[PDB]
Design an enzyme around this catalytic site. Structure first.
Site, PDB file in Angstrom:
ATOM      1  N   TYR A   6       0.856  -1.164   0.000  1.00 12.99           N
ATOM      2  CA  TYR A   6       0.000   0.000   0.000  1.00 12.99           C
ATOM      3  C   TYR A   6       0.904   1.229   0.000  1.00 12.99           C
ATOM      4  O   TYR A   6       1.127   1.840  -1.045  1.00 12.99           O
ATOM      5  CB  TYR A   6      -0.976  -0.064   1.186  1.00 12.99           C
ATOM      6  CG  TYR A   6      -0.398  -0.366   2.567  1.00 12.99           C
ATOM      7  CD1 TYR A   6       0.057  -1.659   2.891  1.00 12.99           C
ATOM      8  CD2 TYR A   6      -0.383   0.632   3.560  1.00 12.99           C
ATOM      9  CE1 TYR A   6       0.535  -1.954   4.177  1.00 12.99           C
ATOM     10  CE2 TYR A   6       0.006   0.323   4.872  1.00 12.99           C
ATOM     11  CZ  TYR A   6       0.498  -0.962   5.180  1.00 12.99           C
ATOM     12  OH  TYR A   6       0.957  -1.231   6.430  1.00 12.99           O
ATOM     13  N   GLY A   7       1.470   1.584   1.156  1.00 14.15           N
ATOM     14  CA  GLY A   7       2.240   2.809   1.295  1.00 14.15           C
ATOM     15  C   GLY A   7       3.492   2.662   2.144  1.00 14.15           C
ATOM     16  O   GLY A   7       4.395   3.492   2.049  1.00 14.15           O
ATOM     17  N   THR A   8       3.618   1.644   2.991  1.00 11.74           N
ATOM     18  CA  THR A   8       4.472   1.749   4.165  1.00 11.74           C
ATOM     19  C   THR A   8       5.947   1.612   3.828  1.00 11.74           C
ATOM     20  O   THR A   8       6.805   2.014   4.613  1.00 11.74           O
ATOM     21  CB  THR A   8       3.993   0.738   5.212  1.00 11.74           C
ATOM     22  OG1 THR A   8       3.447  -0.396   4.565  1.00 11.74           O
ATOM     23  CG2 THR A   8       2.927   1.441   6.047  1.00 11.74           C
ATOM     24  N   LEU A   9       6.225   1.096   2.643  1.00  8.92           N
ATOM     25  CA  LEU A   9       7.535   0.924   2.072  1.00  8.92           C
ATOM     26  C   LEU A   9       7.536   1.605   0.689  1.00  8.92           C
ATOM     27  O   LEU A   9       8.439   1.344  -0.092  1.00  8.92           O
ATOM     28  CB  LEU A   9       7.879  -0.579   1.962  1.00  8.92           C
ATOM     29  CG  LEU A   9       7.692  -1.583   3.136  1.00  8.92           C
ATOM     30  CD1 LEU A   9       8.879  -1.652   4.097  1.00  8.92           C
ATOM     31  CD2 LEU A   9       6.415  -1.563   3.968  1.00  8.92           C
ATOM     32  N   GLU A  32       4.485  -7.185  11.869  1.00  7.54           N
ATOM     33  CA  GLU A  32       3.101  -6.735  11.726  1.00  7.54           C
ATOM     34  C   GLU A  32       2.193  -7.299  12.823  1.00  7.54           C
ATOM     35  O   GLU A  32       0.986  -7.087  12.765  1.00  7.54           O
ATOM     36  CB  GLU A  32       2.577  -7.051  10.312  1.00  7.54           C
ATOM     37  CG  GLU A  32       3.475  -6.507   9.179  1.00  7.54           C
ATOM     38  CD  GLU A  32       3.289  -5.017   8.925  1.00  7.54           C
ATOM     39  OE1 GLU A  32       3.383  -4.178   9.853  1.00  7.54           O
ATOM     40  OE2 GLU A  32       2.977  -4.654   7.767  1.00  7.54           O
TER      41      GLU A  32
END
Length: 149
Positions: A7-10, A82
């Site tokens: 999604y976005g986290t990396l 996670e």
């Protein structure tokens, strides 16, 4: 030896990105890019601004993002970073390939792995949906992992 979807986290500029910058936490390679053409509920919740992807095909919006090839260690590091299975669960979903780098060309969508939740409270279905997750965004709700960092 797998394909995942971020999604976005990396992707944009998130605290988590550092994990994939040391091969000893596992392998990452930019194996093209993509979106979930399958519409999911990306909702922002938790008191630490922990958005979740509930496993609901065709409810919500198309999360834009990227496709990393990973080794078994990167896939395992995320299986401990996670707090899955407690927090999230690892699942399979449909991802439009926006670019495919190299051989092994599934066509204009692929089946990646993602961390999702099926175990949610109903309040999170009344929440709003989004198409990316970026600390840069005007919301003012960003992740708080070490804040001071």
């Amino acid at each position: 030896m797998a394909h995942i979807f971020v999604y976005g986290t990396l992707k944009r500029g998130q605290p988590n990105h550092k994990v994939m910058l040391d091969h000893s936490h596992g392998l990452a390679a930019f194996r093209g890019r993509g979106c979930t053409v399958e519409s999911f509920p990306l909702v922002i919740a938790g008191e630490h601004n922990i958005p979740w992807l509930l496993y609901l095909p065709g409810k919500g919006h198309c999360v834009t993002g990227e496709i990393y090839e990973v080794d078994e260690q990167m896939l395992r590091f995320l299986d401990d970073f996670e707090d899955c299975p407690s927090m999230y669960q690892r699942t399979a979903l449909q991802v439009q390939v926006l670019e495919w780098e190299g051989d092994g060309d599934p066509g204009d969508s692929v089946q990646c792995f993602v961390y999702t939740t099926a175990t949610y409270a109903p309040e999170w279905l009344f929440l709003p949906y989004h198409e990316s997750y970026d600390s840069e965004g005007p919301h003012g709700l960003r992740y708080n992992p070490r804040e001071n960092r």
